[PDB]
Amino acid sequence: STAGKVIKCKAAVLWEEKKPFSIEEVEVAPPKAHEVRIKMVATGICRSDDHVVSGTLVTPLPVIAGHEAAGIVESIGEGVTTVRPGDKVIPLFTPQCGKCRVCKHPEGNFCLKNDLSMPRGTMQDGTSRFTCRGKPIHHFLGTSTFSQYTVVDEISVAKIDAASPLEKVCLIGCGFSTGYGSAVKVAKVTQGSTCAVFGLGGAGLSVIMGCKAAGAARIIGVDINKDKFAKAKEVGATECVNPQDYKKPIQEVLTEMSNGGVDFSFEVIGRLDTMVTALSCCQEAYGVSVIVGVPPDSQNLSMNPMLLLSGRTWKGAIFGGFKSKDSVPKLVADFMAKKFALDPLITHVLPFEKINEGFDLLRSGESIRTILTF
Amino acid sequence: STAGKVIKCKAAVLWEEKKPFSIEEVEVAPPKAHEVRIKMVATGICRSDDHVVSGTLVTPLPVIAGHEAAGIVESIGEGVTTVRPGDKVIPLFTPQCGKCRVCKHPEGNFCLKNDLSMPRGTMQDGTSRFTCRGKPIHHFLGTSTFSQYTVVDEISVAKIDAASPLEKVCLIGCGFSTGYGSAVKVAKVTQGSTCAVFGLGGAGLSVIMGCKAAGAARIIGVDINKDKFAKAKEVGATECVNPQDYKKPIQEVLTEMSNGGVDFSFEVIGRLDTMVTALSCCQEAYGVSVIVGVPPDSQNLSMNPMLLLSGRTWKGAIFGGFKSKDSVPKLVADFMAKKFALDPLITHVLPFEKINEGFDLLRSGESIRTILTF
Ligand SMILES: NC(=O)c1ccc[n+]([C@@H]2O[C@H](COP(=O)([O-])OP(=O)(O)OC[C@H]3O[C@@H](n4cnc5c(N)ncnc54)[C@H](O)[C@@H]3O)[C@@H](O)[C@H]2O)c1
Ligand SMILES: NC(=O)c1ccc[n+]([C@@H]2O[C@H](COP(=O)([O-])OP(=O)(O)OC[C@H]3O[C@@H](n4cnc5c(N)ncnc54)[C@H](O)[C@@H]3O)[C@@H](O)[C@H]2O)c1
Ligand SMILES: [Zn+2]
Ligand SMILES: [Zn+2]
Ligand SMILES: [Zn+2]
Ligand SMILES: [Zn+2]
């Protein structure tokens, strides 16, 4: 069978910036020492993938993007002890080597072996596993889920429940976990608290789920797209405001609504301006603000430090602060137990081939999550 | 007696910015309802006061500054219940109305009654007590301790032990408590951590006393004035670095020293650039950076949101997050029990009249805390 030999398959290769993904045949080389080749079953369309198209998130092109997914191990490389063939797995865009200061810390999850801070677009050995039209194709976040077949490092994959609905749990590989964790793990939303979530897409709604799970009495969803309101309220938002419906600045509106600032604000969009607004909207003397949205490349935000001096707490986080490899298998199990629901995020289920349509659905604000089935 | 009548005494009136504190005769009106008039025994020269002069910290002028102090209750107004004449008290530049949102909050301390964010430079009733040259002089943070007698609203004053050495505990009015709290309360330094303190002044040194008290195994002090090193080490610094001695930006040097970044970083200077540096020096995935230094009025800082997205926590606080009226008496009580040393911050003792010279020392870097006696 396929094990031990280069696997030709279709993948969504991104050649240039701001250009459509090109579904072509790529050569997926076999897994080397401590690498895992996974047959993709379902990949979700996260806004971060679109960020690479726009240039918001700089990474080496050409590249096979995608990181939010779930699949089954085709074959494992030499030295792989954590997964075996036929294992349902979820590629972790944030690895967990377990050997670094961050992995040994009880609170940090951002493993230094991450290829996010300073993208290279390779495996941990610095090489590529994809070849297309001769040219070597770079990897995205050590995952590259936009391919019928992919190869990841052992530290960037987790074995999940064998009876898991991959088409649904793939969201745990990013969107859900991120939002959920940003709520209960990073910010640690309290019982009776008031939260303001900026951005109501896959991650935003997931923050609402986390706020509600934590017992937030009042949850305010903030989106310039009213079509996102209906769902936000469905997942926990107690109300929704549209910045472009008023004349005065939103923080004024939010300040007045919350009566002096919210307990928790979440920036789940990825804009420097809304990041400052989220900070401002949390109570000056004890408010917590968490930045979930990935900011535009090389761009700095200008803010007044007095926002902090007064007593505010500003935070940010990758994968909801969840230690990916230890958490993902645990999050899937909890989904199996039905502690949380991924269905509200799934709005469009298309074939891998329609990847570009799904992206257009995202871009038009018509979709939350588009699940590409392989 | 003077109880019930205007008291003519001397005060340090700052008529214009960047001008000397004119020691002249001002009239102090008797305390109105729920107000308290205190006889100043000793007041500490805090950099925040110098800020008022230089214009860094804005408040209505002409003003009688001063906020770090201790004195005795001369008389109380109608309805005052918390203090009685003859009581040794410390003015709280940060009020504790015990009614507002932040006061009712379990961990908030920047009471809304404060006069820091929106400086009115008056009492709670919007009126002043000071008269000089016939001109009504402003109050500073509702304390105005640069006068032999000042009128503070009841919520901005706390009764400390009758056996408290006022000339030493006046440091608990701000300096010490700020830094100590910033470390032990706001940041919550863990046992065995590596702390990096920016600025080795009275406040900075107190932050060191906090990390040291918290169990911080390492404490790197940062200052462009090498002379401040000896005392830092004396109070807790494991080492101290003069940024000017390096060809590469200090944050890098700090990251290198701590093997990836510090656990807790502190900014006790008040510069925008140093704030960004302190944040960047703490470990990107679990670093906590606490800003204490007051920034130049209306000035914004440009920072990279990725510093936060990775996992850093950035926060600030006024008075070390301590609920003034609550903590203050206890902090004095701890000093009574020899729980922390105040002496190390006291380098010069000068009579109130030699006020300018005290500011000279500060500005020349020849001092930490110059205690003014009356
Ligand atoms: N740090 C992490 O671990 C992590 C994980 C997942 C996603 N993200 C990031 O979070 C952000 C959102 O992800 P998503 O999949 O939910 O995206 P999305 O496109 O589904 O949602 C973004 C939402 O914010 C709204 N919005 C845009 N501008 C707005 C504005 N000016 N005011 C108010 N609302 C506005 C949009 O209408 C949209 O609903 C992205 O930047 C993504 O890259 C980060
Ligand atoms: N947040 C609060 O409630 C609060 C309370 C007290 C003081 N403060 C503020 O904290 C700051 C410091 O207070 P302080 O009382 O310790 O004063 P200070 O002047 O004695 O301390 C400042 C120290 O930092 C050093 N320094 C200056 N520039 C530096 C630089 N570029 N790099 C490194 N070191 C540098 C100075 O040499 C000095 O030793 C002030 O801005 C003050 O207003 C805030
Ligand atoms: Zn690691
Ligand atoms: Zn994502
Ligand atoms: Zn209050
Ligand atoms: Zn002070």
Side-chain angles (χ1 to χ4, degrees):
Chain A
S1 307
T2 32
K5 220 187 67 60
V6 173
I7 298 178
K8 283 182 177 55
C9 69
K10 291 199 302 294
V13 186
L14 180 64
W15 300 93
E16 292 179 85
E17 175 186 83
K18 301 181 178 188
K19 289 292 181 175
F21 289 93
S22 188
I23 309 295
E24 297 175 62
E25 178 195 68
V26 286
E27 304 173 86
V28 182
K32 286 184 177 177
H34 305 277
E35 293 176 2
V36 176
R37 191 149 61 164
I38 310 170
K39 191 190 183 302
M40 289 290 103
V41 178
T43 186
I45 296 182
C46 176
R47 178 63 77 165
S48 316
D49 297 317
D50 173 59
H51 281 340
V52 177
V53 175
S54 44
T56 301
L57 186 59
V58 169
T59 210
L61 279 17
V63 72
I64 289 186
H67 54 284
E68 182 178 278
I72 295 176
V73 181
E74 173 254 346
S75 67
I76 62 180
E78 187 180 39
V80 176
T81 51
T82 47
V83 304
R84 295 143 81 137
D87 267 352
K88 288 189 179 178
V89 295
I90 289 182
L92 318 165
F93 70 91
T94 290
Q96 179 179 3
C97 62
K99 305 187 174 221
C100 59
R101 59 176 293 164
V102 183
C103 297
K104 307 222 213 69
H105 194 247
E107 300 178 274
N109 80 300
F110 204 38
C111 186
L112 290 161
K113 294 293 195 182
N114 79 91
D115 189 57
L116 171 67
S117 307
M118 209 165 78
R120 305 182 308 185
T122 59
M123 297 293 286
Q124 285 299 325
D125 72 335
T127 56
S128 185
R129 298 290 164 255
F130 303 124
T131 309
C132 179
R133 297 200 216 201
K135 290 159 168 179
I137 305 303
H138 278 68
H139 301 224
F140 178 60
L141 297 187
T143 44
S144 314
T145 59
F146 290 169
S147 188
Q148 288 176 315
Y149 277 99
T150 189
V151 187
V152 305
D153 286 274
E154 186 179 21
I155 59 172
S156 317
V157 74
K159 183 178 73 286
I160 67 173
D161 190 357
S164 297
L166 303 182
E167 78 282 347
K168 288 171 177 54
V169 298
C170 55
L171 292 185
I172 293 163
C174 184
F176 171 74
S177 303
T178 296
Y180 199 65
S182 299
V184 310
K185 184 81 149 62
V186 180
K188 294 187 189 64
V189 172
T190 49
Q191 185 83 231
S193 66
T194 296
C195 314
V197 189
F198 293 73
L200 305 166
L205 300 177
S206 299
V207 175
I208 291 175
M209 285 198 210
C211 301
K212 169 164 181 172
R218 186 177 179 206
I219 304 179
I220 312 167
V222 185
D223 210 310
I224 50 173
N225 181 357
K226 66 189 181 194
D227 300 339
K228 303 308 195 81
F229 292 179
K231 210 108 202 188
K233 287 174 188 166
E234 192 175 302
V235 299
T238 44
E239 60 223 87
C240 290
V241 292
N242 178 321
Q244 59 185 50
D245 275 348
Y246 306 80
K247 293 174 174 55
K248 56 184 178 186
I250 202 64
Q251 58 266 85
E252 278 210 75
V253 175
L254 296 164
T255 291
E256 294 164 60
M257 285 182 83
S258 69
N259 291 295
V262 299
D263 288 269
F264 307 95
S265 61
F266 296 87
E267 204 290 340
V268 201
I269 302 161
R271 295 175 55 81
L272 303 170
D273 56 327
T274 33
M275 285 181 201
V276 181
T277 299
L279 178 64
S280 315
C281 97
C282 71
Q283 207 279 144
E284 72 180 328
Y286 62 72
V288 181
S289 187
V290 182
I291 294 180
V292 185
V294 174
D297 179 58
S298 309
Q299 292 176 233
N300 272 221
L301 61 84
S302 218
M303 61 79 84
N304 201 129
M306 267 313 279
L307 298 176
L308 297 164
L309 259 185
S310 45
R312 286 184 173 79
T313 304
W314 212 4
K315 308 167 80 154
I318 301 300
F319 199 67
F322 291 131
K323 283 178 183 287
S324 60
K325 190 151 185 169
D326 293 359
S327 310
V328 166
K330 214 105 85 293
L331 289 170
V332 174
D334 291 31
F335 179 67
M336 306 283 75
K338 294 171 188 171
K339 298 177 186 179
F340 54 84
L342 300 173
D343 259 332
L345 314 179
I346 299 165
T347 57
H348 297 81
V349 179
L350 308 168
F352 174 47
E353 290 76 29
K354 278 81 168 299
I355 180 175
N356 288 290
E357 182 188 359
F359 271 98
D360 287 355
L361 287 173
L362 181 64
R363 298 168 183 149
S364 48
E366 292 159 5
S367 65
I368 293 301
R369 276 296 189 270
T370 304
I371 304 292
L372 306 170
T373 48
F374 299 76
Chain B
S1 184
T2 42
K5 52 193 302 183
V6 176
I7 295 181
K8 293 185 177 185
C9 57
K10 306 194 174 187
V13 178
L14 186 65
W15 296 97
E16 308 158 306
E17 294 176 61
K18 307 171 183 179
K19 289 288 185 172
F21 298 83
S22 195
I23 297 296
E24 46 186 279
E25 186 155 301
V26 304
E27 291 188 15
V28 193
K32 271 183 175 179
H34 296 278
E35 302 184 345
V36 184
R37 182 153 61 169
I38 299 163
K39 169 184 181 298
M40 229 55 67
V41 174
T43 193
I45 295 180
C46 174
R47 178 68 72 174
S48 293
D49 291 300
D50 182 35
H51 288 350
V52 184
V53 187
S54 52
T56 299
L57 175 64
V58 172
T59 181
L61 269 51
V63 68
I64 291 173
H67 53 278
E68 191 178 292
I72 288 176
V73 182
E74 186 266 349
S75 71
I76 54 180
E78 292 295 328
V80 175
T81 50
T82 41
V83 296
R84 326 200 71 136
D87 277 324
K88 286 185 177 175
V89 294
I90 292 176
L92 317 171
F93 73 86
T94 305
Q96 187 180 330
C97 58
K99 301 171 183 179
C100 82
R101 181 180 165 150
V102 191
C103 294
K104 303 201 70 181
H105 187 258
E107 294 189 340
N109 85 307
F110 197 39
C111 180
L112 289 157
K113 302 287 158 62
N114 79 81
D115 197 50
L116 189 63
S117 48
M118 311 290 276
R120 290 193 302 177
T122 40
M123 295 297 282
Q124 282 306 341
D125 67 346
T127 56
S128 184
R129 294 295 164 286
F130 296 142
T131 318
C132 180
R133 298 186 189 184
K135 307 158 196 173
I137 306 301
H138 282 110
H139 292 244
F140 180 49
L141 304 186
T143 62
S144 295
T145 59
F146 283 177
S147 181
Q148 298 178 307
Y149 284 86
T150 187
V151 180
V152 298
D153 290 277
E154 189 176 357
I155 64 173
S156 294
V157 58
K159 176 187 168 182
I160 63 179
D161 198 69
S164 314
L166 306 187
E167 58 282 314
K168 306 181 184 302
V169 300
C170 60
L171 297 180
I172 301 190
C174 178
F176 162 79
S177 298
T178 301
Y180 197 72
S182 302
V184 303
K185 190 175 182 66
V186 185
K188 301 171 193 295
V189 181
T190 49
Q191 182 189 320
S193 46
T194 287
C195 300
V197 175
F198 281 60
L200 313 174
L205 289 176
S206 300
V207 181
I208 292 182
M209 292 190 190
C211 305
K212 180 67 183 290
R218 201 163 177 198
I219 302 172
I220 311 165
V222 182
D223 209 305
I224 60 175
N225 179 350
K226 12 170 293 298
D227 294 342
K228 302 306 189 72
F229 295 178
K231 225 145 189 50
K233 308 288 195 58
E234 199 183 285
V235 304
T238 53
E239 52 221 288
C240 294
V241 301
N242 182 325
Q244 306 167 120
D245 294 1
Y246 304 80
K247 289 183 175 178
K248 67 175 197 169
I250 195 63
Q251 70 279 4
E252 296 185 18
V253 181
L254 289 168
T255 301
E256 190 181 273
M257 294 169 66
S258 48
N259 299 103
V262 303
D263 289 81
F264 309 90
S265 53
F266 299 94
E267 198 284 346
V268 201
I269 303 168
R271 300 178 55 88
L272 293 179
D273 55 289
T274 41
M275 292 177 195
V276 181
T277 297
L279 176 71
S280 308
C281 84
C282 68
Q283 209 284 122
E284 60 166 35
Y286 57 72
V288 180
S289 194
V290 173
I291 304 179
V292 180
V294 174
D297 180 81
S298 300
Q299 289 189 224
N300 278 255
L301 57 74
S302 192
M303 64 76 77
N304 190 188
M306 280 307 295
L307 301 182
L308 301 162
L309 232 211
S310 42
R312 288 187 182 100
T313 299
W314 205 10
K315 61 209 307 182
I318 300 296
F319 196 54
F322 279 138
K323 284 175 186 290
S324 58
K325 199 154 187 161
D326 281 345
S327 316
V328 164
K330 301 170 186 173
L331 290 177
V332 175
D334 287 322
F335 183 65
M336 298 297 93
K338 298 259 301 189
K339 292 305 179 184
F340 54 87
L342 283 175
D343 271 324
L345 308 181
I346 312 169
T347 62
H348 293 81
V349 183
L350 308 182
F352 174 58
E353 300 77 48
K354 296 295 200 64
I355 185 168
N356 291 297
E357 286 97 300
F359 275 84
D360 277 88
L361 288 165
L362 178 66
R363 296 180 182 113
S364 49
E366 279 187 65
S367 63
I368 293 303
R369 273 300 184 269
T370 297
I371 302 298
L372 297 180
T373 44
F374 294 80

mmCIF file of all heavy atoms in Angstrom, chain B residues 10-34:
data_model
loop_
_atom_site.group_PDB
_atom_site.id
_atom_site.type_symbol
_atom_site.label_atom_id
_atom_site.label_comp_id
_atom_site.label_asym_id
_atom_site.label_seq_id
_atom_site.Cartn_x
_atom_site.Cartn_y
_atom_site.Cartn_z
ATOM 1 N N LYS B 10 2.625 77.488 56.539
ATOM 2 C CA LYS B 10 3.373 77.484 55.297
ATOM 3 C C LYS B 10 3.117 76.222 54.484
ATOM 4 O O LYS B 10 2.753 75.169 55.026
ATOM 5 C CB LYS B 10 4.864 77.667 55.587
ATOM 6 C CG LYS B 10 5.136 78.904 56.426
ATOM 7 C CD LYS B 10 6.593 79.309 56.440
ATOM 8 C CE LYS B 10 6.760 80.641 57.171
ATOM 9 N NZ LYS B 10 8.143 81.198 57.098
ATOM 10 N N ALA B 11 3.275 76.347 53.173
ATOM 11 C CA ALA B 11 3.070 75.228 52.266
ATOM 12 C C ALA B 11 3.961 75.420 51.053
ATOM 13 O O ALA B 11 4.561 76.486 50.876
ATOM 14 C CB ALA B 11 1.615 75.155 51.842
ATOM 15 N N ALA B 12 4.060 74.385 50.230
ATOM 16 C CA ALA B 12 4.871 74.440 49.030
ATOM 17 C C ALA B 12 3.942 74.646 47.852
ATOM 18 O O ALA B 12 3.377 73.693 47.322
ATOM 19 C CB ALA B 12 5.649 73.154 48.872
ATOM 20 N N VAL B 13 3.766 75.900 47.458
ATOM 21 C CA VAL B 13 2.888 76.222 46.344
ATOM 22 C C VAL B 13 3.602 76.231 45.001
ATOM 23 O O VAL B 13 4.557 76.985 44.789
ATOM 24 C CB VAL B 13 2.160 77.580 46.548
ATOM 25 C CG1 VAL B 13 1.291 77.890 45.345
ATOM 26 C CG2 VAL B 13 1.296 77.537 47.791
ATOM 27 N N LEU B 14 3.143 75.361 44.109
ATOM 28 C CA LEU B 14 3.690 75.263 42.761
ATOM 29 C C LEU B 14 2.763 76.096 41.883
ATOM 30 O O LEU B 14 1.658 75.668 41.520
ATOM 31 C CB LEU B 14 3.713 73.811 42.278
ATOM 32 C CG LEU B 14 4.415 73.608 40.934
ATOM 33 C CD1 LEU B 14 5.888 73.941 41.089
ATOM 34 C CD2 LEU B 14 4.227 72.176 40.443
ATOM 35 N N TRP B 15 3.196 77.322 41.618
ATOM 36 C CA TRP B 15 2.437 78.264 40.810
ATOM 37 C C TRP B 15 2.462 77.907 39.335
ATOM 38 O O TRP B 15 1.429 77.887 38.667
ATOM 39 C CB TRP B 15 3.011 79.674 40.981
ATOM 40 C CG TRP B 15 2.897 80.204 42.357
ATOM 41 C CD1 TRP B 15 3.860 80.196 43.324
ATOM 42 C CD2 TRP B 15 1.737 80.807 42.946
ATOM 43 N NE1 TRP B 15 3.369 80.754 44.483
ATOM 44 C CE2 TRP B 15 2.069 81.139 44.278
ATOM 45 C CE3 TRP B 15 0.450 81.099 42.475
ATOM 46 C CZ2 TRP B 15 1.157 81.744 45.150
ATOM 47 C CZ3 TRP B 15 -0.455 81.702 43.343
ATOM 48 C CH2 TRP B 15 -0.096 82.018 44.665
ATOM 49 N N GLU B 16 3.660 77.628 38.840
ATOM 50 C CA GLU B 16 3.857 77.323 37.438
ATOM 51 C C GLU B 16 4.660 76.046 37.314
ATOM 52 O O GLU B 16 5.280 75.597 38.278
ATOM 53 C CB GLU B 16 4.610 78.488 36.777
ATOM 54 C CG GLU B 16 3.957 79.855 37.036
ATOM 55 C CD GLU B 16 4.905 81.035 36.884
ATOM 56 O OE1 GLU B 16 5.977 81.045 37.531
ATOM 57 O OE2 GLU B 16 4.555 81.975 36.137
ATOM 58 N N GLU B 17 4.612 75.444 36.133
ATOM 59 C CA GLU B 17 5.361 74.230 35.877
ATOM 60 C C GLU B 17 6.830 74.616 35.859
ATOM 61 O O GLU B 17 7.167 75.795 35.718
ATOM 62 C CB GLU B 17 5.002 73.651 34.508
ATOM 63 C CG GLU B 17 3.577 73.155 34.359
ATOM 64 C CD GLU B 17 3.279 72.697 32.941
ATOM 65 O OE1 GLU B 17 3.943 71.751 32.462
ATOM 66 O OE2 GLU B 17 2.387 73.291 32.297
ATOM 67 N N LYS B 18 7.692 73.615 36.019
ATOM 68 C CA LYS B 18 9.141 73.789 35.991
ATOM 69 C C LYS B 18 9.623 74.984 36.808
ATOM 70 O O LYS B 18 10.582 75.671 36.443
ATOM 71 C CB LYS B 18 9.605 73.870 34.532
ATOM 72 C CG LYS B 18 9.113 72.686 33.713
ATOM 73 C CD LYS B 18 9.366 72.832 32.230
ATOM 74 C CE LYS B 18 8.782 71.635 31.487
ATOM 75 N NZ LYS B 18 8.973 71.709 30.013
ATOM 76 N N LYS B 19 8.950 75.214 37.928
ATOM 77 C CA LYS B 19 9.289 76.304 38.826
ATOM 78 C C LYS B 19 9.456 75.720 40.219
ATOM 79 O O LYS B 19 8.984 74.613 40.497
ATOM 80 C CB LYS B 19 8.177 77.358 38.832
ATOM 81 C CG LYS B 19 8.064 78.169 37.549
ATOM 82 C CD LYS B 19 9.217 79.145 37.400
ATOM 83 C CE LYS B 19 9.035 80.027 36.181
ATOM 84 N NZ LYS B 19 10.063 81.100 36.136
ATOM 85 N N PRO B 20 10.210 76.413 41.084
ATOM 86 C CA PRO B 20 10.437 75.950 42.455
ATOM 87 C C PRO B 20 9.191 76.064 43.348
ATOM 88 O O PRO B 20 8.339 76.934 43.149
ATOM 89 C CB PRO B 20 11.561 76.869 42.937
ATOM 90 C CG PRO B 20 12.311 77.168 41.674
ATOM 91 C CD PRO B 20 11.182 77.465 40.732
ATOM 92 N N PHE B 21 9.088 75.171 44.325
ATOM 93 C CA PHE B 21 7.968 75.179 45.251
ATOM 94 C C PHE B 21 8.131 76.383 46.155
ATOM 95 O O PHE B 21 8.973 76.389 47.057
ATOM 96 C CB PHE B 21 7.963 73.902 46.088
ATOM 97 C CG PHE B 21 7.790 72.658 45.282
ATOM 98 C CD1 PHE B 21 8.878 72.065 44.653
ATOM 99 C CD2 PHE B 21 6.536 72.087 45.133
ATOM 100 C CE1 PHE B 21 8.716 70.923 43.889
ATOM 101 C CE2 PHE B 21 6.363 70.944 44.371
ATOM 102 C CZ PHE B 21 7.456 70.361 43.747
ATOM 103 N N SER B 22 7.352 77.420 45.889
ATOM 104 C CA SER B 22 7.435 78.630 46.685
ATOM 105 C C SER B 22 6.910 78.369 48.085
ATOM 106 O O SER B 22 5.742 78.018 48.269
ATOM 107 C CB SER B 22 6.643 79.757 46.021
ATOM 108 O OG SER B 22 6.990 81.017 46.576
ATOM 109 N N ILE B 23 7.798 78.452 49.065
ATOM 110 C CA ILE B 23 7.392 78.246 50.445
ATOM 111 C C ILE B 23 6.847 79.582 50.921
ATOM 112 O O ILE B 23 7.599 80.536 51.138
ATOM 113 C CB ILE B 23 8.568 77.793 51.347
ATOM 114 C CG1 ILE B 23 9.100 76.429 50.887
ATOM 115 C CG2 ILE B 23 8.118 77.719 52.809
ATOM 116 C CD1 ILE B 23 8.098 75.295 51.010
ATOM 117 N N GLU B 24 5.529 79.666 51.009
ATOM 118 C CA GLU B 24 4.878 80.885 51.446
ATOM 119 C C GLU B 24 3.684 80.574 52.326
ATOM 120 O O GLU B 24 3.272 79.417 52.444
ATOM 121 C CB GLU B 24 4.475 81.740 50.243
ATOM 122 C CG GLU B 24 3.789 80.989 49.124
ATOM 123 C CD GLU B 24 3.569 81.866 47.921
ATOM 124 O OE1 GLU B 24 2.594 82.639 47.929
ATOM 125 O OE2 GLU B 24 4.382 81.808 46.979
ATOM 126 N N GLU B 25 3.147 81.609 52.959
ATOM 127 C CA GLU B 25 2.016 81.458 53.857
ATOM 128 C C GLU B 25 0.673 81.292 53.156
ATOM 129 O O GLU B 25 0.247 82.165 52.400
ATOM 130 C CB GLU B 25 1.959 82.636 54.830
ATOM 131 C CG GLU B 25 0.895 82.497 55.896
ATOM 132 C CD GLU B 25 1.228 83.282 57.137
ATOM 133 O OE1 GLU B 25 2.296 83.014 57.729
ATOM 134 O OE2 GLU B 25 0.426 84.161 57.522
ATOM 135 N N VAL B 26 0.012 80.172 53.434
ATOM 136 C CA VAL B 26 -1.295 79.864 52.865
ATOM 137 C C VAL B 26 -2.266 79.659 54.018
ATOM 138 O O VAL B 26 -1.853 79.332 55.135
ATOM 139 C CB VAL B 26 -1.284 78.553 52.006
ATOM 140 C CG1 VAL B 26 -0.234 78.637 50.909
ATOM 141 C CG2 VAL B 26 -1.044 77.326 52.886
ATOM 142 N N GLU B 27 -3.551 79.870 53.755
ATOM 143 C CA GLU B 27 -4.580 79.674 54.767
ATOM 144 C C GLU B 27 -5.235 78.326 54.510
ATOM 145 O O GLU B 27 -5.476 77.961 53.358
ATOM 146 C CB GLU B 27 -5.640 80.781 54.703
ATOM 147 C CG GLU B 27 -5.152 82.155 55.138
ATOM 148 C CD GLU B 27 -6.269 83.189 55.243
ATOM 149 O OE1 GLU B 27 -7.463 82.810 55.264
ATOM 150 O OE2 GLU B 27 -5.950 84.393 55.320
ATOM 151 N N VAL B 28 -5.464 77.565 55.573
ATOM 152 C CA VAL B 28 -6.111 76.266 55.453
ATOM 153 C C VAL B 28 -7.454 76.396 56.156
ATOM 154 O O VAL B 28 -7.521 76.658 57.364
ATOM 155 C CB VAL B 28 -5.288 75.140 56.114
ATOM 156 C CG1 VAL B 28 -5.834 73.782 55.693
ATOM 157 C CG2 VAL B 28 -3.830 75.266 55.737
ATOM 158 N N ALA B 29 -8.522 76.290 55.380
ATOM 159 C CA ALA B 29 -9.866 76.410 55.925
ATOM 160 C C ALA B 29 -10.210 75.201 56.781
ATOM 161 O O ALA B 29 -9.698 74.104 56.549
ATOM 162 C CB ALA B 29 -10.876 76.562 54.795
ATOM 163 N N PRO B 30 -11.042 75.397 57.821
ATOM 164 C CA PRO B 30 -11.419 74.271 58.678
ATOM 165 C C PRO B 30 -12.115 73.198 57.846
ATOM 166 O O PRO B 30 -12.710 73.490 56.802
ATOM 167 C CB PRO B 30 -12.367 74.916 59.690
ATOM 168 C CG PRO B 30 -12.903 76.103 58.962
ATOM 169 C CD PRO B 30 -11.685 76.636 58.279
ATOM 170 N N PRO B 31 -12.025 71.935 58.276
ATOM 171 C CA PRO B 31 -12.675 70.879 57.506
ATOM 172 C C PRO B 31 -14.200 70.976 57.500
ATOM 173 O O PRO B 31 -14.817 71.256 58.524
ATOM 174 C CB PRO B 31 -12.176 69.611 58.196
ATOM 175 C CG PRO B 31 -12.001 70.045 59.615
ATOM 176 C CD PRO B 31 -11.333 71.381 59.451
ATOM 177 N N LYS B 32 -14.789 70.815 56.318
ATOM 178 C CA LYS B 32 -16.239 70.834 56.174
ATOM 179 C C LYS B 32 -16.786 69.464 56.598
ATOM 180 O O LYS B 32 -16.063 68.641 57.178
ATOM 181 C CB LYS B 32 -16.635 71.116 54.719
ATOM 182 C CG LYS B 32 -16.800 72.585 54.353
ATOM 183 C CD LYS B 32 -17.268 72.706 52.905
ATOM 184 C CE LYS B 32 -17.568 74.142 52.501
ATOM 185 N NZ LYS B 32 -17.987 74.205 51.065
ATOM 186 N N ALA B 33 -18.057 69.211 56.301
ATOM 187 C CA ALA B 33 -18.673 67.936 56.641
ATOM 188 C C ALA B 33 -17.932 66.758 56.003
ATOM 189 O O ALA B 33 -17.568 66.796 54.826
ATOM 190 C CB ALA B 33 -20.128 67.929 56.207
ATOM 191 N N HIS B 34 -17.689 65.729 56.805
ATOM 192 C CA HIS B 34 -17.017 64.510 56.359
ATOM 193 C C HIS B 34 -15.599 64.707 55.842
ATOM 194 O O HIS B 34 -15.114 63.902 55.039
ATOM 195 C CB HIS B 34 -17.854 63.784 55.304
ATOM 196 C CG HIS B 34 -19.177 63.297 55.808
ATOM 197 N ND1 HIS B 34 -19.319 62.113 56.500
ATOM 198 C CD2 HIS B 34 -20.419 63.830 55.718
ATOM 199 C CE1 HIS B 34 -20.592 61.939 56.814
ATOM 200 N NE2 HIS B 34 -21.279 62.967 56.352
#
